[PDB]
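User: Show me an example of a complex going from sequences to structure tokens.

Assistant: Sure. Here are the input components:
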Amino acid sequence: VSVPALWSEVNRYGQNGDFTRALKTVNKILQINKDDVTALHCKVVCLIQNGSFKEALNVINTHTKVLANNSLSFEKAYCEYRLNRIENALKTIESANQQTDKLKELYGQVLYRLERYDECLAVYRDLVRNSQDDYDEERKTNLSAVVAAQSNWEKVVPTHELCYNTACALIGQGQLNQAMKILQKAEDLCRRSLSPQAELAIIHGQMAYILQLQGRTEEALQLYNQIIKLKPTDVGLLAVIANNIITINKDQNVFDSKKKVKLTNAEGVEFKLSKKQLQAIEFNKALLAMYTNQAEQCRKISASLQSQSPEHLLPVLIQAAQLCREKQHTKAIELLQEFSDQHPENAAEIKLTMAQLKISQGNISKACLILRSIEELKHKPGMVSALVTMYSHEEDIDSAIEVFTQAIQWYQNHQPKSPAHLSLIREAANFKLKYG
Amino acid sequence: PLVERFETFCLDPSLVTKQANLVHFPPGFQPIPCKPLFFDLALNHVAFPPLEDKLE
């Protein structure tokens, strides 16, 4: 059959939409002639569209000797990225001779998968502002997803999909009341759309999160159970819902907690979820192991998490909890002490826990001493109240009034005439009245 | 817990007995929000090269 005839059939079938028989005639062209770079480009494109990224990767690797010229940089990078080989895809995109729009957008997706939200946000801003196409709403909701992730985990102040992502961003920013209203607006936009229930399942999964945050635990649990029973096809959403149910259950529904944990560790979960989400999952299952007498695996998870130095979730406390549960917590004393010493920026909450441990049975004076050592939160009305009542327990009146004086002086230096300031002055005045 | 009560001057005499309740010990669980909706648009960019140079 004449080669232009096969090319015309290939073009017609490629614009038709299906690709299997297009691949069959492309490889017929290949067996006709071995040295047409367009034929192998069509072959790798057909393989990518058919979901066989490994086969296209193998073809590119085997034919790299003859490819040359422009090279299949974008196709190889996309095959690596879809094969979770993000690290190699980074240099595959970076080592390309020329940068195209497809390469830039693939690079943005890879950077999102790398949690490098700054460069990903910049490149996707450039993508939205520069490239115009038929999926501009998809680009908008992807940029909104990036900013929502950054605001939720990196602590950065910033259609139903875009509304849901805006609700996610509001959740990250700390707003909860208007998040429910925006999620209801997105629920309306979804309900008018399909009349495909997984897109409503994720909306309800985010709704139940807000319900749990505000204290409405029962409705959140019912929503989570109904979402789980609806069986959405996603895997990351199931992990998020499962660990939120973990947090709701705490140490009560351990039998369902094991089920949620087994749903939390599935195939592809480590790639769909962020690193912060995975670390919080590790923290949650370490907590569950602690509450389920599993100590060795709890310690293993805690050590593995500490090896990564988490930004927000300090796991040494869990280990301290371990040494508090087995009643030989004298080692925990120096453990938290040295952790606070090595990490002055995180020492404050560690010493706050240290104080509670040093009021557990006795040695209250040392507890007050380590409470005083927390300079960051020293002049707070609650902590000075605790110090005053502790000092009054053993009648250290002078220490209590001197604590009052330091708190008052610091408040005068920083925020004079505050309502909390005047409350402190009046409380100190009446305490001195009732204690000379 | 007292960690979430760093305001006012409640007497809360539980602080001097065993049940101090200064902080969440054992530490509390950490729920995570659902991951934002992201779209793999790069699947839309894979297509045949221009065949106009090699058609009939």
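The lines above are the inputs; the final block is the predicted structure for all two components together. Residues 1-28 of chain B form one domain.
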